[PDB]
Design a protein around this ligand. Structure first.
Ligand SMILES: NS(=O)(=O)c1cc2c(cc1Cl)N[C@H]([C@H]1C[C@H]3C=C[C@@H]1C3)NS2(=O)=O
Ligand SMILES: NS(=O)(=O)c1cc2c(cc1Cl)N[C@H]([C@H]1C[C@H]3C=C[C@@H]1C3)NS2(=O)=O
Ligand SMILES: NS(=O)(=O)c1cc2c(cc1Cl)N[C@H]([C@H]1C[C@H]3C=C[C@@H]1C3)NS2(=O)=O
Ligand SMILES: NS(=O)(=O)c1cc2c(cc1Cl)N[C@H]([C@H]1C[C@H]3C=C[C@@H]1C3)NS2(=O)=O
Ligand SMILES: N[C@@H](CCC(=O)O)C(=O)O
Ligand SMILES: N[C@@H](CCC(=O)O)C(=O)O
Ligand SMILES: N[C@@H](CCC(=O)O)C(=O)O
Ligand SMILES: N[C@@H](CCC(=O)O)C(=O)O
Lengths: 260, 270, 270, 260
């Protein structure tokens, strides 16, 4: 029984190689998540087929319709069996899907155009000269929406009532916007993606300040599935064997086409 | 029914209060773990009684007897209901108990005695003889050890990495023994060995010991791996999911970060 | 019963919102005074309707008619129940209305156009032609004026200090008139007079105007006196003591401090 | 009828006369508050007799007995007709006595021994190596006790549970303690007293940071008295005529027995 593996096109997690037109099956995808899925399948011992989520959404709930979209939606509604992808572990997701142990620590970080005047998030909220937003229907926007801290509350209140739409549909759109804004825009995204972008050409983006919080990516399965314990054990074994460290070093720092 | 919580006597997780010779109950202990347990009880309502393991060990499987000891061992046999303590999530422990999501990140680091400032135009520089684990294993004048019945010892024993295997081979055949009974004993050995002893402990304890007086120890290199601390629940128990969601809520509301900052960096003696 | 609150259109106390054409009710206005009114209504439960005086004056006595005008005047005759606005507590006003305890300190300051950074090694220095009220009165090249029907004009009219008396004598016999009908008009005169006009206004508005773009104005010297802003109330009204208690309570909680920091410092630039 | 005036020996508000052994009446007292009382009597037109409060406390409520001590007690219980003294206007006091308009602005300040490693009160709260307390039965301890701010809550919790007693019976004891502590103790007191102390010899104490909050001194009268409105009008007249500024300049900066 082939296991359906939903995932999203995120770099360096999943990429469509370079000559994908002449390739078929899972051989046309490469990245950290592809390697993670291969190791998970090797440990558990199942045949899998990588599938790309129909909409480029990680997963959230719509305007009071209680419907999950993106990867979480495909998991809940039975459209997929497992999600090896950068899915942040959150409160709202955990109640509906089974998350494994985190395979990568991360956090929310500020990235800007290349002594920065903002540095910390407090100064970023205080100064209204520079605009800042998040990814639409992701996890950072939900973190800001439900945040009770005064600084994050001010951040979310400004971001929601902003003209034009300060949010972006895809993280690539966000990095393009912050590159083209001539330093007038700040992008809020995961620390791992921030470091990957800052370690790539043309190296015009830099990460400033610290991490707003601490989160992690987990392998998600439908609630009440038989694969949750095996994939949890496989993630633990991979972490203890250094496989996750090796994969992150390969896909984040082995190439390093940046000047640092 | 009041459940029993087990914890280890580790700072700044659970430390006896100053006036603890006359106090009774959970008010005797202060630290990160006590008010973490308070927050857990506040989220999901239950009555808890803090307890300390008699052996004072974190937990490991004994060879040729397959008997778990320490916090994990006493949690398996049913004399505890929940382990809110700096217990490291491992593969061996996950097959006998249930671990929640990590509430604090950590890693294996190296602790050494802080060298004196180098004299040479008038700038002072810090020169250290060990800067990573590769050169720590490649030398012989400095002994290094871990904590017995801990996660680090099991990690080094079961590691297939070349440098980690070399360090494990060194500490296995070491005379006198480089293993310590308690973290505080390891720090005492580090401060007493005049700079010839390195301690392989967790990064959180290393940073906490660095921040407090007499601050004669330093952390060299990065972490050897990435791990986490989880709240341990007996396998097949009713306190697993509520505790996991409680940890998730405390992470999302910022309680964990504020607790860490007020228990590690607020009391920055040095 | 819904009581009517009067206020003046003075930044940052009350400013029309950007989308104020379609919005109705108290949501039209934003600023320090609307937040103060909300807090006052939260202290003691009552419904309020924000209003703006038609004449747009703070309040003064007319010549030879002994008739009050402005916010104070319309509060005396009973067309308003409470004045939550930057109304300065004075002796003449206290004899006809009731003032609560000051909710913000202030003083009379001098506003001039900011000069250019002077150069002579390669350091830029700030050189100003006026640095006190004494040298402002002694000099004659730069004209100075105040706000019509304001507290500062009454202070200068009834001042027995030699310097203040000289300045008032200059203002009375001034051609063309140095008095402005609105604070914004005075700042516009300062900006467009290219350094030949000095505005004598309240310290809070002076700092607020200095803190925003294009920030071509500067405050010279210190405050000529010390005063405060109070919430006015008609004599013998039931709203006096509850509002005074509310102001004291908001001072104790530090709500006034955070309102000031949010409406004066956070929104500033340059 | 001679109006009884209660006051406390505080410098430079009320000071004992140099040759007071040979003097009697109100001519044996001098200071800012003595001049204030003289101006109030001149404006209202009443004869007064300055009386020193029995216990050197400004006023507070005791441990669950609802009894006012100090000057507020003398006012409430009919033992005094008016209080021209540095009495801080507070919500708890206003409910039992009638304050006039503030005749002097002030705030909580941090005063230490003369690199300045303390800065604002945030660092003072985050630091456990330096001791700091307040005046007992005053208004600063009440402000710290009822404060709902996290920094001030931490300050109060540390101060109450401190061994030995971090509080001082009189402000002079506090300044002596901070002088003799070799920089290990900090004293929290009113900004006016802090400035007066640092401006007088030996000038070994210096102020750091800004004022914690803003308060003021008002002339207190018994509730439901006929003197409240006349003294309020007199205070307003004195403020308008510059008499209060003149007296502050006379008693704070006119001597200036310091090098600054
Ligand atoms: N260095 S890293 O970001 O690639 C990374 C991060 C993490 C890893 C492993 C790696 Cl390699 N494993 C941990 C897991 C292992 C066991 C202990 C904590 C969880 C359960 N999660 S983690 O702390 O999020
Ligand atoms: N900054 S820290 O080490 O005290 C720390 C570390 C971690 C926190 C929260 C804090 Cl405050 N929460 C995460 C949890 C939240 C969700 C995502 C990963 C786990 C499940 N684990 S963590 O990445 O191990
Ligand atoms: N810092 S400020 O100008 O916003 C400011 C100014 C003042 C505040 C509070 C603040 Cl936050 N409260 C005082 C009041 C409190 C009690 C003592 C004096 C009045 C009654 N008035 S004040 O001295 O005019
Ligand atoms: N410069 S000072 O501290 O001596 C000082 C302080 C103050 C003065 C007068 C002086 Cl001289 N008057 C004001 C009062 C006057 C009118 C306006 C506010 C109150 C009512 N209170 S105050 O703002 O506390
Ligand atoms: N990776 C996040 C979204 C990225 C972001 O919000 O910055 C998720 O799983 O939803
Ligand atoms: N925290 C570790 C013990 C400390 C160590 O091994 O350094 C554990 O849970 O096993
Ligand atoms: N705030 C002053 C008016 C402003 C001014 O006179 O500068 C008043 O209440 O009268
Ligand atoms: N002046 C204050 C007391 C001074 C202090 O506590 O520092 C009062 O009236 O209570």
């Amino acid at each position: 029984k082939t296991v359906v593996v939903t995932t999203i096109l995120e770099s360096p997690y999943v990429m469509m190689k370079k000559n994908h037109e002449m390739l078929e099956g899972n051989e046309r995808y490469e990245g950290y998540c592809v390697d993670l899925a291969a190791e998970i399948a090797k440990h558990c011992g199942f045949k899998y087929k990588l599938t790309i989520v129909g909409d480029g959404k990680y997963g959230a709930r719509d305007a009071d319709t209680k419907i999950w979209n993106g990867m979480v939606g495909e998991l809940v509604y039975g459209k997929a069996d497992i999600a090896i992808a950068p899915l942040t572990i959150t409160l709202v997701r955990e109640e509906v899907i089974d998350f494994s142990k985190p395979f990568m620590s991360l956090g929310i970080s500020i990235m800007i155009k290349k002594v920065s005047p903002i540095e910390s998030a407090e100064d970023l909220s205080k100064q209204t000269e520079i605009a800042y937003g998040t990814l639409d229907s992701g996890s950072t926007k939900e973190f800001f929406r439900r945040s009770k801290i005064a600084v994050f509350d001010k951040m979310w209140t400004y971001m929601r009532s902003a003209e034009p739409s300060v949010f972006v549909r895809t993280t690539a759109e966000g990095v393009a916007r912050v590159r083209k804004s001539k330093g007038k825009y700040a992008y809020l995204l995961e620390s791992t993606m921030n470091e990957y972008i800052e370690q790539r050409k043309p190296c015009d983006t830099m990460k400033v300040g610290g991490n707003l919080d601490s989160k992690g990516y987990g392998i998600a399965t439908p609630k009440g599935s038989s694969l949750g314990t095996p994939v949890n054990l496989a993630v633990l074994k991979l972490s203890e064997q250094g496989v996750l460290d090796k994969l992150k070093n390969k896909w984040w720092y082995d190439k390093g086409e940046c000047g640092a």
